[PDB]
Amino acid sequence: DYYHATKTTIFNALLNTIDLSQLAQLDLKQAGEEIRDIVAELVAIKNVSMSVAEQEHLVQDIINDVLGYGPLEPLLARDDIADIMVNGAHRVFIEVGGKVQLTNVRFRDNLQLMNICQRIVSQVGRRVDESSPICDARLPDGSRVNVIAPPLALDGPTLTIRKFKKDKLTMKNLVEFASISPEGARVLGVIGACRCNLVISGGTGSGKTTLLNTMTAFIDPTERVVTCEDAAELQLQQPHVVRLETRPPNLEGSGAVTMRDLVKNCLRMRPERIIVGEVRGPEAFDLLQAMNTGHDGSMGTLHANSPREAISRIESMITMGGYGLPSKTIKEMIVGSVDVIIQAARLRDGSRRITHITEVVGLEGDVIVTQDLFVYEITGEDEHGKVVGKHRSTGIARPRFWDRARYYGLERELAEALDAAEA
Amino acid sequence: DYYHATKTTIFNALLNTIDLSQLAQLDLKQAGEEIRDIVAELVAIKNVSMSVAEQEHLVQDIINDVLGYGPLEPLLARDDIADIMVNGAHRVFIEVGGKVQLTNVRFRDNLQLMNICQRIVSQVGRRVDESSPICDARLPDGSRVNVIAPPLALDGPTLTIRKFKKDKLTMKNLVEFASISPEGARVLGVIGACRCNLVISGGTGSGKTTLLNTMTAFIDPTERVVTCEDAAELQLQQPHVVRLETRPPNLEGSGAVTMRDLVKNCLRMRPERIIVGEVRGPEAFDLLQAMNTGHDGSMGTLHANSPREAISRIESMITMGGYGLPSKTIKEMIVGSVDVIIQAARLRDGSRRITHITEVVGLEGDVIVTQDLFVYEITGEDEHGKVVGKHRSTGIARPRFWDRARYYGLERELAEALDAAEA
Amino acid sequence: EAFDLLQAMNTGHDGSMGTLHANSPREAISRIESMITMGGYGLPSKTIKEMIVGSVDVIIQAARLRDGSRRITHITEVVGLEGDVIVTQDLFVYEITGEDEHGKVVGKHRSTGIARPRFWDRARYYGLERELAEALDAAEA
């Protein structure tokens, strides 16, 4: 009841005594203590229906106005809310238990919201205003903030926040959700630990990224990484990561940095796992060379259905590269670099499965000989509209990289998994 | 633990006495005197546990605050620090002889790191900002620096400085290091002493310049040599040498001396060999003229992965020159000029080898013909983790440049080396 | 922007929409391919068709009659990619019978009589399947 008018009076009185114009003076603690005392004194000096509880509340609200986020502080705190969505200064929604709901926490007006947004984003050296009404940011708490201003958004400043995620889609989620076998899971774990290159290919909707992220989660932390993504989608877990991104054409048809330049520049910064987001232009070439010159453990993605189609696509990309190499040298390079070409595909039942786990055995004539470590053999389709199969093995005694797995000190696990898969 | 707090206090005292807002006053020497004087006065009046050495360190820290590099200096001053990696404002890693770790040295604000990067690239007339967000450079002291800007790097600026090191390899030592087999060593000695227009290609981190120095160590003394470099790296061991270097554009971007102009002028100094430090632009054109109009022995290095890409890149550069030459003319010119291409590269396991020793044979329509004498054919990898190969020989009975070998009477030794290698 | 929109049709935002300028659903799909190629991402010409076959699930065509009136004409779907061409299974259509004594065009809204449309499986989730079956049956009668 008496919160609004009393808070307005406190704001006016404190501004008269010690306003924000004293910035750089009455440091955060100093201003907090002084404002608390001034509000306590004004509650009696001026008629204030705010009792002791309302007195502490007014002190807290003054702290918020001068310093804090105000109405978002509660929701930003609560642990049952993962995502917060503010549509104009009036309506705020929250994702509780995997579903959106409305809770009335209004802002004083649009100016307040458009100031809170800047105070939020600038915490990591950004700023959003009427000369750049878009903003996105990532924070130390694993969160991600996205802000749009009133020049575009009609309703009013629109904010979206996704707070900490901790249970990233680790392998066990893939396993138990009927998309990969256990022994295959251990084989993948070893393929990732042994810094053996890999390339991921999946039909439309196969979800290349999710898989690539699950794989990156394997790298040993001591290995410096450089992820040259197209849009900031990968969410790595290591301490040593280094992000990047491209830039599209400007209004004058210039000022663009295509991913080729980024992949070229990543060579300098002494990396040890040049991860990529997607391979469409000639960048393939550069990436492959990076795989060969002593960066054992890179990754990547591309669009193709069956692994052999993936190899053909890579060769087509390089040919589009405009370098004119013979059709044999390119194949030799691919056979020398790539070590596993995982697969991912979406089946008619709407699920998502890892159909193949293919290697690159070698070069023979004009055919790059490959062998498979696992495959997805369907058995039938159920009444509920599903497609069900099984992950079949091939009892292979030794892959091409067995020596490497012997080196990095995880030799047994590979054979244990491959042999026990027959169980 | 008094270092940080005392330093903050002394910085505040200096700012109150002489603040950075007084720019254009208290200049280089005036500052070097007044800052030290105020520091001594504060240390005398203001009890600081810092000693005379610590007092000098604090004085230098304030000097850095004024016009310095930021906290990089205490790192750079060391010798065990072989690499400095920034990755944003909040982290600085280092490698110390085989191991790598994090350090408890940090920056204050992305403004500090960004300004330090802009300054250190202004040392060699380079500027990195929101218009050209990428900058690679080599500082005069010898070490290499790379920097990426906020628009791409999502974590603010990212900067890497690689410690300088010296190789000075020799052809008699390369054989022990297993780079080139002794038969190859004799063949290359003949190829270098016989004034053969060659081009030493190389891939990322391959280490061309060492090879180029090792090769030029074969030149006969009296020959008047002329280089054209950008960093003053080489170390020629001949009495009659003339050295050179380009002068990048001034702060206003005017009066620049591009390697092209250096070459076009070296054409008039009566040189016998025009060595070049590297090939980046249309200067190749001029160099090719030097390769053709009676300056036999000109060398040079360009960044290419395999010879049949190096040729295409040379053609692309010449076309980019904007001369309007039809492509076929460019191919004719290259076929006429170049004589040998030595493609060196770094294999996966980190070693350095010489993979190709090729000779341009001629032109047949729209395809250039090459007759690789050697190829470092990969055989396998040992159990200890290092690859294994062998320098196979195609064993051409008489290479193209045989005539030259005759004119200098060295042909017999080349024939012996071929016979040994042919088997 | 069509490409980006297709991403939304793909990465679990099922329910996107859009509007574009065309006359014949095949012409509409050709226009979409042209738009995606405009971006210059370098995609081949078959992957674009794969993307458009895996993304879209209805292509409604509405038109203006020659006479000066508007009618809804096609409720075509997308069935798949057979080789290098896209296929359709137009559910409903509107056929121009002729003219009246005044001159206005006349016609009938007809259902080709397909039994289980492609999106039927999806409609199974939301318990609409019975309603769709009933409507198609009444049309077929």
Numbering used by the authors:
A (entry chain A), B (entry chain F): 80 to 502
C (entry chain B): 362 to 502
Q: What did the study's authors say about this model?
A:
Pilus dynamics are powered by the ATPase CpaF (TadA), which drives extension and retraction cycles in Caulobacter crescentus through an unknown mechanism. Nucleotide cycling occurs through an intra-subunit clamp-like mechanism that promotes sequential conformational changes between subunits.
Henceforth, this CpaF structure obtained in the absence of nucleotide is termed CpaFAPO. CpaFAPO formed a C2 symmetric hexamer with subunits arranged in an open, closed and open’ conformation like CpaFAMPPNP and CpaFADP. Superposition of the three distinct NTD2/CTDn+1 units within the CpaFAPO hexamer showed close alignment with RMSD Cα ≤ 0.7 Å. Consequently, the nucleotide-binding pocket in the open state subunit differs significantly in comparison to CpaFAMPPNP and CpaFADP as the associated NTD2/CTDn+1 unit has rotated.
